Each structure stands twice: as structure tokens, then as C-alpha cells.
Amino acid sequence: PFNNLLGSTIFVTHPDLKRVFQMALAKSVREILLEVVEKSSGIAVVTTTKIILKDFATEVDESKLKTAAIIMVRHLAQSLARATSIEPLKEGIRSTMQSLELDTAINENIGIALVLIEKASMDKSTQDLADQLMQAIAIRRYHKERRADQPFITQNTNPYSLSLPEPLGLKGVTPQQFRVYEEFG
């Protein structure tokens, strides 16, 4: 659609064919968009929820939880989106093209279509998580205001993480190094 479908030759540079091409991409996207986003984000928010809470059990400053919670589920969804959408999109993009050299043209412009299924599956992921992190975000607000100098959480289970060793395990608070791991990627 926008930005001329650059760069390419043929289908991009021929106006009559340019129209039916843009119509093929849009129909391709709208077809799998609903199917992909629901499933991908569904795995993203769940798999991050269980991971983050386990690792962050001793962590305070929900802003520091939110920061590492958001970027984890966002990037993980965007990665599961592109990977999921790539194959069926193209196969559909060609299938809807012949009905109404191809691979060379579409592989240049498949970037846009992918970016939408990413952006969409990301935002619904950041949403569904925030609603499911509410109880975990709230239970730390009470423990922040009501009891300050006290140790943190141990909400349900950390039986084997009660072990001693160096920062492969739960501490106090999460050290700057441990918080750096989930701070990047």
C-alpha cells in the first residue's frame, strides 16, 4: 500500500498490476491476522507470566518489574509472530494472486505485511499481560506501603531456590546484573 511497495521491479512499476497486488497483500494479511495474534499473544503472555514471576519473586519496584515484563513479552510475541506468519502469508499471497518471478517481488515487500502482524500481536500481548499482572502488581503495592523495611514476598513456592549460591539464584533484591539479563533480550 503506502510507500510505493519499494523497492522492486515489475508488479510495483506497473499501475494496473500494482492495484491487484496491494489487494492481494491486504486480503492475505486480514486472513491470517486474526488467527495468528490470538494464538501467538496467548503463548507470549502466559509463558512470560510464569517465567517473570518465578524469577522476580524477591523483586520490588514494580516499575523495574514492568520494564522487564513488557520488553520480554513484546519481543517474544514479535518473534513468534514473524515466524508463524511468514510461511502461510506468502503461500496465500501467491494463491490469491493466481486466482485473480512472483517470489522475487513479494519477498521484497513482505516486510510491511509482517510488521503489522507483529505490531498487532505485540500490543495485545502488552495488554493481556498487564491485566494478568494486576494481582501480582497490587500485592506488592500493599507490601510496599504497609510494611517497608521487611523482606519481600515468597508468595507461594521457592523451596529449592532457598539454596545459598552465587547470583544464579534469588536474593534482599535482584542485583543490577540479574536485572540486566532481562533488561536486554
Next chain:
Amino acid sequence: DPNVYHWICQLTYGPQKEQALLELGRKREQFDDLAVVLWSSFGVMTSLLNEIISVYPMLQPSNNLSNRVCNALVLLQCVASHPETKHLFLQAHIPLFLFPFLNTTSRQRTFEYLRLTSLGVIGALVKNDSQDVITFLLRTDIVPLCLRIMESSSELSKTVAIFILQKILLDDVGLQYICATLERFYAVTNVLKDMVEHLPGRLLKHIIRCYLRLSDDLEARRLLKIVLPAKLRDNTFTEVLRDDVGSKRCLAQLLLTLNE
């Protein structure tokens, strides 16, 4: 013990971390532990998952990169099949990241090992016989995907594929999903029929096991009467079946269950 802590530390932070992945993978068979240590440890699961998700753009067609991620896969395979960490791993929706790997059709030795290692995880996930695993797997396109593997590619990956299926069929919930419809029934039967004609090996013992399982369902028991591969009814496989008692007792019963 304390050559492990340093490697795990490296895996999370320390620069090499492929060597550590290699080392820890080699020592994964001892102490009957470290499965819990891998899960309970901070940053490990996030890191192990990061190794996997870095292979996604590479799925367009490789090399040692495929060996690196394969080492992270056996690590996850170690986490799986461990009673403490199994249901935690399962309920954490981690294994669902291994399906795009399994979707790869490439027959290169690399992608052959990729799928093979990844198959080991799911195979280990069903190894301990837990019903919640089955009901989780049937949520997904796994069973049709295994069927793709069973007919083609490598005898090794096939042996893993037929095993995973046999486990699902063994469960009452799995035997319901398969053999629910003719579309799903004839999807599995034809492949099993193909492998028998296209055929010591374990592939035969598992195939017989699957038929004997499908012999339970009466609606399946009827259709199998006609749809049974004649090779099994014949004596063709007898010679190789003399060495396996269990395979013989299952095949004999399958024939006994067949007809009336």
C-alpha cells in the same frame, strides 16, 4: 558439583556460553539433579529460551549455530522428564516454541538434527506417562506434524515420531482425538500402511503397538478389518519378530482382535 555452577553462570552471563551449553549438555546424565537447578536458578530459562529464539531468522533455509541450539534443546529435554520441573515446564508454555523447528521441511543434515533434537524434548515430555501432557499436546497441530515425519526423512527421527504418537494413542483422551473422524483416522492409517510396505528395527514394534491400540476402539476395529495392511497378516515379518517377544504377543493379539 562446583564445575557446574561456573558453567551455568557462564550460560546466563559469561561470554563463551556455547562451550558451557556443550559442557552442561554432556554432564546432563548424572547426579539425578540439575533439572531443578536449571529451573530454580535465575535467568537460566530466559537465557535458554533466548538461544532458541535466535534461530528463527535462520529458519528460511545451517552450521554450528544448529549445533549450539541443539545443545540448548537437550538441556530443555533434561528439564522435561524430570517430575519436579516437568509440569512446571509444561504449564509454562515453553515447549510450544519448538514447533516452528518441527515445521521445517529441509532435509539437510543440519535441519535433520534440529528436528531430531527437538523431537527428543516432546518425546521426553511424554516419557513419564502424564495425562495432562497429552491434553496439552492435542491443543496443537503436533499429531499431523509427526505424521509428516513418520513417512519421510530419517529412520531415527521416525522412531521418535512413532513413539510420541504411540504415547498419545495409549492415553484415552488421545485415542479420542485421533479416531474421532475418518479424516484423522485415515490420516494415521495410510502412513502406517506406507511405512510397512516401504519397510532388526524398533519401527516395526511401535507400528504393531499403534494398530493394537487402535484395535481397542470398536468403530476403528471394524474399519481396520479391511484397512489392515496384508503384510502383517502374512508371515513376512515373522523372522525378524522372533527376536522380540513383546512385539509378537502384540501382533498375535492384534490378529486375534481382528475379525472375530
